[PDB]
Design a protein around this ligand. Structure first.
Ligand SMILES: O=c1ccn([C@@H]2O[C@H](COP(=O)(O)OP(=O)(O)O)[C@@H](O)[C@H]2O)c(=O)[nH]1
Ligand SMILES: OC[C@H]1O[C@H](O)[C@H](O)[C@@H](O)[C@@H]1O
Ligand SMILES: [Mn+2]
Length: 541
């Protein structure tokens, strides 16, 4: 399963009676010396593969009317196969680090209780829980602002709360306008202050703002900052403000854009996590992820037919937490819908086990390609809630580059829109017009997905983050890898290509309670339920 030799290819692209051009002879040359490269690093072999590819597309280019073009194009495919061979066969130890991120406010007990499960079965792994010591008040800032906007929109309706269609669609639309205006009022303040006193940290600007505009007590905010700092210190805290390579890189301004202006802590988390992986190596996990259940644990209990495979994965966890109680206040919602007979079997199995290690598996020694970042999977494809990479992996670099390039395209259209000082609607329309003018056949779908950006976290079903800093940057990077290029914007890879980068399902339990509620986004059914709750509160409060 090695790949084609110098004269093995030379008989493949043999065209009768016609001379061998310089750029063709370069392919063969580079190909032979690749086979003498069993001294070189895994990266050096990829870069030799990239170049053979860069010479082959340059041979075709110059000779559009060449008989070699059929074999020259079949060779380009053999090169892809070889990357996949280079990746799977040449594995190095993954650094024993677990990376979590919680930024924007205090860490809640739930996250720590999830994190501690990883701690309890991975004593040989170092754990970082990343926080930003300048920015404990963003979550407070957003919540105050959203609630102020909730109350203002309801003040607008009220005499029309009954009817007709002052429905949940209309509410979130109006609320968006108010939110935009408040956010832009804060952003303007932030920038006025940073220009005046460049020494002021995020939280200083924020608490002064909350005091001036929402009558919050600075003393209580200060107390909150001090408690949050103490709590994260007690829990493997690691400060973004001491991560120097991150502070000084080209992604820090983007990270702050998301933190300070957009209040999207998931997008800020996306930008930081890949950088942690690039700089330290190891395994990244969202705080709503729990260890993998032992393969042979529930092997005696059979999934009944009246149950989703995903319902079953949820119940497996809930049965562990009902009987072993590892995580307090874990839901039993789905477990309780089972039979007597089926609930009995779970207790009976969760009985013969005494150690947490008989329930949850350990990561132990892991290995990956110096080329790759491994990514978790769910039914909708790849997902960056789990990631594995060795320090300075080739992909970690390609993913960083993808994210920065995606932001460069966004900010190029967004910023001129914003720096005209208009309301939500006009700014949206200018922004979209601009995105539309810069769109082309290469970046089309991605551009369509960018136009909802001003609404992220504030309106139902707005997922822009996925295309900017999330899973799509990862797919683009894998395509960069497999196509010997950089800057893919048009994803043509299918499921089978991406499967090469999967973390095995046994290493993570993804079907957790906290996974089932998104911190940066919300669907329509949730938006409807929220609307109705807010009306009641307004009526009763
Ligand atoms: O206030 C917040 C909210 C989210 N996050 C980060 O964003 C990640 C993704 O959150 P979530 O799992 O809700 O996103 P989802 O899986 O629904 O896309 C979390 O794990 C945290 O790392 C954060 O740091 N602070
Ligand atoms: O990229 C946006 C989000 O996408 C995914 O759903 C991940 O669960 C989360 O870690 C990330 O923040
Ligand atoms: Mn999640």
């Amino acid at each position: 399963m090695s790949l084609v030799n110098r004269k093995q290819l030379e008989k493949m692209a043999n065209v009768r009676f016609r001379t061998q051009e310089d750029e063709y002879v370069a392919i063969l040359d580079a190909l032979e010396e690749y086979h003498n490269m069993s001294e070189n690093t895994v990266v050096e072999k990829y870069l030799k593969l990239k170049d053979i590819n860069s010479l082959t597309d340059i041979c075709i280019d110059t000779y559009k009317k060449s008989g070699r073009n059929k074999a020259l194009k079949k060779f380009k495919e053999y090169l892809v196969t070889e990357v996949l061979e280079l990746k799977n066969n040449n594995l190095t130890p993954v650094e024993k680090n677990l990376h979590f991120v919680w930024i924007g406010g205090q860490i809640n007990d739930t996250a720590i209780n999830y994190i501690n499960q990883w701690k309890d079965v991975n004593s040989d792994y170092n754990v970082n829980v990343f926080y930003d010591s300048n920015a404990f008040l963003i979550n407070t800032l957003k919540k105050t602002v959203v609630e102020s906007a909730i109350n203002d929109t309801l003040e607008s309706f009220r005499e029309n709360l009954n009817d007709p269609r002052f429905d949940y669609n209309k509410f979130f639309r109006k609320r968006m306008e108010i939110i935009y205006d408040k956010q832009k009022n804060f952003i303007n303040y932030y920038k006025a202050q940073r220009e005046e006193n460049p020494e002021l940290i995020i939280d200083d600007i924020v608490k002064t703002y909350l005091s001036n505009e929402y009558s919050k007590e600075i003393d209580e905010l200060n107390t909150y900052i001090e408690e949050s700092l103490n709590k994260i210190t007690q829990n493997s805290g690691n400060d973004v403000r001491n991560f120097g390579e991150f502070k000084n890189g080209e992604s820090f301004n983007l990270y702050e854009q998301e933190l300070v202006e957009r209040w999207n802590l998931a997008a800020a988390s996306d930008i930081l996590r890949i950088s942690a992986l690039k700089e330290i190596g190891g395994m990244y996990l969202d705080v709503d992820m729990l260890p993998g259940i032992q393969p042979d644990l529930f092997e005696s209990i059979e999934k009944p037919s009246s149950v989703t495979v995903d319902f079953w994965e949820m119940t497996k966890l809930e049965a562990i937490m009902k009987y072993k109680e590892y995580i307090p206040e874990y839901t039993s919602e789905h477990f309780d819908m089972l039979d007597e007979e089926v609930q009995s079997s779970f207790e009976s199995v969760l009985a013969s086990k005494s150690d947490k290690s008989e329930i949850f598996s350990s990561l132990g020694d892991m290995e990956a390609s110096p080329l790759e970042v491994k990514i978790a999977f769910n039914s909708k494809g790849i997902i960056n809630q789990g990631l594995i990479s060795v320090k300075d992996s080739y992909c970690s670099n390609l993913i960083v580059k993808q994210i920065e390039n995606r932001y460069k395209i966004l900010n190029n259209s967004l910023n001129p829109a914003i720096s005209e000082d208009n309301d939500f609607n006009t700014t949206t329309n200018t922004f979209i017009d601009s995105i539309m003018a810069e769109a082309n056949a290469d970046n089309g779908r991605f551009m369509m997905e960018l136009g909802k950006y001003l609404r992220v976290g504030f309106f139902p079903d707005v997922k822009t983050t996925i295309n900017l800093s999330g899973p799509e940057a990862y797919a683009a990077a894998y395509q960069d890898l497999l196509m010997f290029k950089e800057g893919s914007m048009n994803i043509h890879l299918i499921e089978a290509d991406l499967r090469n980068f999967e973390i095995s399902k046994t290493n993570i339990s993804q079907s957790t309670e906290q996974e089932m509620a998104s911190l940066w986004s919300f669907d329509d059914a949730r938006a409807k339920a929220q609307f109705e709750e807010y009306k009641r509160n307004y009526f009763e409060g």
